[PDB]
Design a binder for these strands. Structure first.
Length: 168
RNA sequence: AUGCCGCGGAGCUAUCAUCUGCCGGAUAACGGCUGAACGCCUCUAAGCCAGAAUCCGUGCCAGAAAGCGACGAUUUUUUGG
């Protein structure tokens, strides 16, 4: 299990804390869940184990996957396309606070607080489509899941999720 | 042994009259996120969210008579400090 380091990124190991940096943004993550030694050869990071438990087999893959998520996230983006299917719908707000109105004919102006590092572009290029941008894959995925779960159904038309995109 | 009757201030009293009676966290069931192993997949394996009249708190009552703090003057020309 080897993964080369991209050019321009500075990834370091400090008590299993990764501080992935780039000219367009910085991301951080804690790894107090893996018992695999981390080494650097000056051009590639290596994971080392010595006859551990069987859970370490999944630990290596999880560490490789999250390090790959950080590597793609520091350079590229995580564009999220939210589609609205229906009773009219609208999202008129400013800043990092997103407000949704007229859900199934309701009148409550329920508000949503976005996670740190997430900036919805709120562009109206495509009808009933919302573009969500966030450098942290975990945070943007949690935010998108929260948005979908906020609009729930009781005593049963609906709104579902859509595909994703790419930025940077 | 308040003789009886009507009205009778004050007091007492009446869901027979009037006034007043909050919001923060942690959760159970349960729903999700990144994500492997079991190269797929799945809320879970680590973690992070949401979540009940539940629990703990804000608030309300008492105040350790052997818990504590700050402040005031320290027997007046007999005598004591």
């Amino acid at each position: 299990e080897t993964l080369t380091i991209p050019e321009g990124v500075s990834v370091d190991i400090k008590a299993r804390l990764v501080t992935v940096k780039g000219p367009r943004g910085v991301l951080k993550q804690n790894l107090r869940r893996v018992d695999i030694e981390l080494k650097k050869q000056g051009n590639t990071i290596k994971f080392i184990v010595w006859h551990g438990s069987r859970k370490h087999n999944a630990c290596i893959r999880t560490a490789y996957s999250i390090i790959n998520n950080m590597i793609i996230g520091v350079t590229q983006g995580f564009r999220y396309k939210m589609r609205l299917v229906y009773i009219n719908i609208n999202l008129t707000e400013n800043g990092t606070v997103v407000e949704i109105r007229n859900f199934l004919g309701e009148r409550i102006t329920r508000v949503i607080k976005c996670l740190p590092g997430v900036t919805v572009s709120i562009s109206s290029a495509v009808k009933d489509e919302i573009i969500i941008e966030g450098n942290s894959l975990e945070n943007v995925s949690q935010s998108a899941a929260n948005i979908k779960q906020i609009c729930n159904v009781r005593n049963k038309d609906g709104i579902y999720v859509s595909e994703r995109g790419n930025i940077e």
